[PDB]
């Protein structure tokens, strides 16, 4: 055939993992990748729903599209089959994030060196932007209502494995792991989780203040 | 492997000892009986179980250890018309043919003899030796390479420990094992036994035995219900036992399988023990009436297209049922729903 | 990484008084022995050491061997290195050692009656079911899991020609030199393996070549077990400034007398 289906499959997989799951992967993505992905979606009849969704945002990029329950189910099935990750939560927030990101990209002009913009954009519910204190108080009110679940009172010292071999084997198994990769993954993961929760919360985040000041505080207190 | 046309092969379980009565002189075109008889054996050890006085017909007897030769191909064996030749449990390609007939009495049927002629002496009502492991008895070890020494003990004693020197090549180990197994199958009562070898080698030996019995069956030998059991199946049996079987029965595998044989028929389905005991090669069972087992199948095969799955295979139905069960149970994940699709025919 | 000494599991199953584990680090090695050198020198009169067998082609091959731990004036039970089944309790007065030691020794000699008596008497003590029951179960399980491997390998040796170890005394006239071959064979598999790995033969036969190390015997097997009494003569000595200045490193040639008894046969295949 005239289409490298495998390579376009790989490109679409990478881009969707980059935008939707927002996995730790972070590399430069060029117009080639988006073109390949759109062609891949258009080619597959199964993915015509996703293709139509992406196309719709070209004109108006400021709204969640209206669908039916069956349409949503089929869309979830198509996305799950594409990603080949049934063991994940991709219910609705994933789709909204993807629509927002593609709305930004398609309605963005050409740039020489990236844009590097946070995915805090085009939130839903059309709610006025809310403050941390207001939402925190409102939600804590619900939290403080009732319903604990376990009553551990006396308190036993935190157990520790006394066998050294059980520790030396673990050290041997875990040693080859590079520490930098682990730290980078964990940090990026916390960042993305906070970003998604905040975006759904429909509030105004601190781009380079709250997490940044937290890091600064840790470094200063440990150092000086 | 293309056997020469002068070879005659007799195979029987009771050939672990030399069959003196069956050895007779052969006549070539010279039409003169040849009395110089020459015999071959696997190892020098077997020489100590061949009487020179058990051949009244023959004038002179010469014994040799059958040592493999390379200068002579099996396609055109060397001919020595000056002496009759009779082999015994050969383990390498035969290379020497006596005048006229050349019988080969063996208890093992390798590939080298497969394409030769054959006269199997099948067996009636074999006993199945019992395999177990100690983890309370006086274990009686046996020299596997020379079982003929301990014939009286094998007849009388009950527990036995297969023991092999590291010298023995794989073929000789196989031959000794087959000897001892035939001895057991001829025993008056089942005998317990174990092997003092690493498990992988035991599996290799049992694969060899299974293929040997397959060749025997393909030459018309009567089937034997006694056979070895795969180690993975043994682990599954041990897990089932630990789950519910308290003691260590002698034939606990047979116990499980018959304990489910009691139910195979009336409910019309395979007991899952059999399924796990076994890609494709799907097993079934029968009754005198026409009906299969796994789906209650007809005697032909899996039907090609019996009825549509529109109401089930659609993603909407499976999703609705999944959401219903998840909401009712309070789960968030860990539950999988599959449509009832394996419906051959009711 | 894992120790392989039977005495390495010795524990005071009282839950109050601590227990000792004097086993040396070498007891973790799977060299064939099953005793830590400390316990070997403590309970028995043995001291692990190795002997290398070379050739004219400079090839390495070493075998296990033991050493005396008795002096000269000691007699009677003191001369016994490894007692027999009947005469072990008296020489070891098991009533004086820890109960776990007694249980282990009974298992070694396969004294089932002693094991059953110790178990059913230990049923009586208070707090037994709490933790002493599980401790006795752990000790018994470990002892079984150490003994078990030995019996097959000892049994298989007692089956076929691979290595024909004959304890026949050289120079048949000699002395008592009892052919206790079956008294050895009356030992448990662990004891048989230990004695085989402890004493080496005087004549050795590899393939067809013949090798000899000692002109006479060193120990001897008797109804009271293996006793380090040299046949036909007094026992050998055991050691346990100017002239010293002029004597430098001159191949000290250790004077302690190691074990030497029996006859061995080596087939081509053994390694």
Tab-separated table of C-alpha atoms in Angstrom, chain B residues 66-73 78 92-93 95-96:
chain	number	residue	atom	x	y	z
B	66	UNK	CA	28.682	-54.243	20.915
B	67	UNK	CA	30.940	-51.253	20.298
B	68	UNK	CA	29.741	-48.844	17.630
B	69	UNK	CA	31.606	-48.843	14.319
B	70	UNK	CA	32.047	-45.986	11.869
B	71	UNK	CA	33.763	-47.483	8.808
B	72	UNK	CA	30.637	-49.410	7.743
B	73	UNK	CA	27.322	-47.815	6.806
B	78	UNK	CA	29.123	-56.076	6.516
B	92	UNK	CA	23.399	-48.077	18.101
B	93	UNK	CA	22.867	-48.825	14.378
B	95	UNK	CA	26.410	-53.007	11.388
B	96	UNK	CA	27.087	-56.758	11.092
